[PDB]
Amino acid sequence: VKFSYMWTINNFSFCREEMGEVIKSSTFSSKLKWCLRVNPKGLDEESKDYLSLYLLLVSCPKSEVRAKFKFSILNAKGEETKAMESQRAYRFVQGKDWGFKKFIRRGFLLDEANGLLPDDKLTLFCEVSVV
């Protein structure tokens, strides 16, 4: 079953999150509930120069599901760019997240000349395929 979520994070340049701090999206579905989570300053010292991006299984009545996923950024022209796809379907349990600790370099994303923060909005697009 394949579905998607578009997450707009407004006023992205005003984010005060420090390394390890997280923002979660609203939940979305295709009884399963998913959300996205971003670490604007990464998780640890190795990733503090990047935004980290994860898919989280928030609610699941089964013990586990398997899902592949793809994240991309919608640019100022409304087009997908800088996509990263999971290598395979990963096993999720409720509370488990999978994703990319080094999804996008902050010094690239935050320079507005690259066109990824139109009106200071970061727009992320996620596709999920549950096996």
Curated annotation (Swiss-Prot):
Expression across tissues: Widely expressed.
Domain MATH: 2-128
Annotated consequence of substituting residue 54 to A: Strongly reduced affinity for substrate proteins
Stretches for region Important for binding substrate proteins: 90-100
Subunit structure: Interacts with GLI2 and GLI3. Homodimer and homooligomer. Heterodimer with SPOPL. Each dimer interacts with two CUL3 molecules. Part of cullin-RING-based BCR (BTB-CUL3-RBX1) E3 ubiquitin-protein ligase complexes that contain CUL3 and homodimeric SPOP, or the heterodimer formed by SPOP and SPOPL, plus a target protein, such as MACROH2A1, PDX1/IPF1, BMI1, BRMS1 and DAXX. Interacts with IRF1; this interaction mediates IRF1 proteasomal degradation. Interacts with HNF1A.
Extra remark: Antigen recognized by serum from scleroderma patient.
Function recorded in the entry: Component of a cullin-RING-based BCR (BTB-CUL3-RBX1) E3 ubiquitin-protein ligase complex that mediates the ubiquitination of target proteins, leading most often to their proteasomal degradation. In complex with CUL3, involved in ubiquitination and proteasomal degradation of BRMS1, DAXX, PDX1/IPF1, GLI2 and GLI3. In complex with CUL3, involved in ubiquitination of MACROH2A1 and BMI1; this does not lead to their proteasomal degradation. Inhibits transcriptional activation of PDX1/IPF1 targets, such as insulin, by promoting PDX1/IPF1 degradation.
Recorded domain comment: The BTB (POZ) domain mediates dimerization and interaction with CUL3.
Family per record: Belongs to the Tdpoz family.
Protein name: Speckle-type POZ protein
Organism: Homo sapiens (Human)
Lineage of producing organism: Eukaryota, Metazoa, Chordata, Craniata, Vertebrata
Portion of the full-length sequence here: 30 to 164 of 374
